[PDB]
């Protein structure tokens, strides 16, 4: 049966995956293909038209261009960026000696992710971003693994130079991902590792193709000021020195927490 199921698995065909853009009619929908073209697709009796509306990722057909099945919504399923590969090594007792600054982080991180009603009773909004800086060699890299060894929630590691891969519209889309997955995967914590790049003013010498990085900074600034519900998701951004970061971010309204590790 295992060998016969191999032929049965090869009899199946491919299925196109796309997201619904606009609803043309009851049986007529407009779904954008993953390659970027759009088509008017039909419906079947095996799917529910209530979940076929806009903002929901569906499955199309590669032959007749029709809706076949329904899949859960995943923007760009890159797991290595979503999973942080947690292996417990260093805990809060291994980062000790920083306790003056350790008890400072747990109040704006562990407390709002546990009992959020404390900040709601006073009326203050929970802090979004937290800045961890200091001299090199103080364990700022270990701060990501120490906090992650306790809460045990999801953690998204997003290196600076790993997301700068040159593509059309992809550089600004990667930031949109982490805030889009934060609703379905729970707010948890999003981590940024040693970003010296996007925080620059970037006077124009020709920029040498780096204009794709400029829209990356614009997406990060508009996200904090966006109308979407935020404040539950924590943004941990670490860097060697703060001045290289965007002064628009350092000012209040986006990054409310500057935590020094001297």
């Amino acid at each position: 049966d295992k060998t016969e199921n191999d032929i049965k698995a090869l009899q199946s065909i491919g299925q196109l995956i796309g997201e619904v853009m606009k609803e043309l009619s009851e049986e007529k929908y407009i779904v954008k293909a993953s390659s970027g073209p759009r088509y008017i697709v039909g419906v079947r009796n095996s799917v529910d038209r209530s979940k076929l509306k806009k903002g929901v990722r569906v499955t199309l057909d590669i032959t007749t261009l029709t809706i076949m099945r329904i899949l859960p919504r995943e923007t760009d399923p890159l797991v290595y960026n979503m999973t942080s590969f947690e292996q417990g090594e260093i805990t809060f007792d291994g980062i000790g000696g920083l306790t003056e600054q350790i008890r400072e982080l747990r109040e704006v991180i562990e407390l709002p992710l546990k009992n959020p009603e404390i900040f709601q009773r006073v009326g203050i909004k929970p802090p979004k971003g937290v800045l961890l800086y200091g001299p090199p060699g103080t364990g700022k890299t270990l701060l990501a693994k120490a906090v992650a060894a306790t809460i045990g929630a999801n953690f998204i590691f997003s290196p600076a130079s790993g997301i700068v891969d040159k593509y059309i519209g992809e550089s600004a889309r990667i930031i949109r991902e982490m805030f889009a997955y934060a609703k379905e995967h729970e707010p948890c914590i999003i981590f940024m590792d040693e970003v010296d790049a996007i925080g620059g003013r970037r006077f124009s010498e020709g920029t040498s193709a780096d204009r794709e990085i400029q829209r990356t900074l614009m997406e990060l600034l508009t996200q904090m000021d966006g109308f979407d519900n935020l404040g539950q998701t924590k943004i941990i951004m670490a860097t060697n020195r703060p001045d290289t970061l965007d002064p628009a971010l350092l000012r209040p309204g986006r990054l409310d927490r500057k935590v020094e590790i001297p």
Binding site: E4, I7, K8, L10, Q11, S12, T64
Partner: protein
């Protein structure tokens, strides 16, 4: 209960091999079907005949070779692997001990209940030349599932190219009115008068239609309120009939213009 959906390709393909074998009325052809019986709607995407031999003077005589069935299943795995044996069909109007006893023979190679089919070669009466029958172990009785005819987009139009308003649509209404008359009178007169069969099990379902001029005279007072929508339809239609005079008056300018040019 369940449902049955058979494409028109399966129905006519079963009739072809009947004449190709020069099968007279004394003999009948038996074959197998393929599809997906797992869901509530049984779909038949394929059919194959079998060398069935039967004596006309004895209903206990039949010839069924499973080696041809075992080979047929192996030949289909190289064509369509998604298809499995969902049952078997047969020809001829009559049901005798030949087709009744073999229903358990196909059960060995069929996971679901084999779906019995009577293929009418002469197509006598109404629609549906083939009827889908299912058997129960609890007493055995042949029940007909809501068999329907449906195919894909290219399969439905494909037979339309090979074959190639309001008054015509009303012609089929009278044919359905006589169907109500001729089915009840012929059946009810058989149960009553001479030769009473064992009944009152079916009578409960028959009179279940008559309770709800077959329906209700208690709403006659309320019917006039339901007829109001029909009277409303004539309110606009009186102007719609006058809307034809709009173009009729505009077209008067054309001929009047022709007299000027002449």
């Amino acid at each position: 209960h369940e449902k049955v959906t058979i494409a028109p390709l399966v129905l006519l393909s079963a009739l072809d091999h009947y004449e190709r074998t020069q099968t007279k009325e004394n003999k009948r052809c038996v074959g197998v079907i393929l599809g997906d019986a797992n869901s509530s709607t049984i779909r038949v995407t394929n059919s194959f005949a079998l060398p069935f031999e039967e004596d006309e003077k004895n209903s206990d005589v039949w010839f069924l070779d499973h080696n041809y069935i075992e080979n047929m299943n192996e030949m289909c795995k190289k064509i369509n692997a998604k298809e499995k044996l969902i049952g078997w069909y047969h020809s001829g109007p009559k049901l005798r001990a030949s087709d009744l006893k073999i229903n358990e023979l196909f059960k060995k190679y069929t996971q679901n209940n084999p779906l019995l089919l009577i293929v009418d070669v002469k197509q006598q009466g109404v629609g549906l030349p083939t009827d889908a029958y299912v058997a129960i172990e609890q007493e055995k009785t042949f029940l007909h599932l809501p068999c329907t005819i449906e195919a894909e987009e290219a399969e439905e139009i494909g037979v339309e190219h090979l074959l190639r308003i309001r008054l015509t649509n009303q012609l089929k209404s009278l044919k359905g009115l006589q169907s109500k008359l001729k089915d009840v009178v012929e059946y009810l007169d058989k149960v009553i008068n001479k030769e009473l069969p064992i009944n009152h099990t079916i009578l409960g379902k028959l009179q279940d239609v008559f309770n709800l001029n077959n329906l209700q005279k208690a709403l006659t007072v309320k019917t006039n309120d339901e007829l109001m929508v029909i009277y409303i339809s004539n309110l606009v239609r009186s102007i719609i009939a006058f809307d034809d005079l709009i173009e009729n008056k505009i077209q008067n300018k054309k001929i009047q213009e022709q007299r000027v040019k002449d």
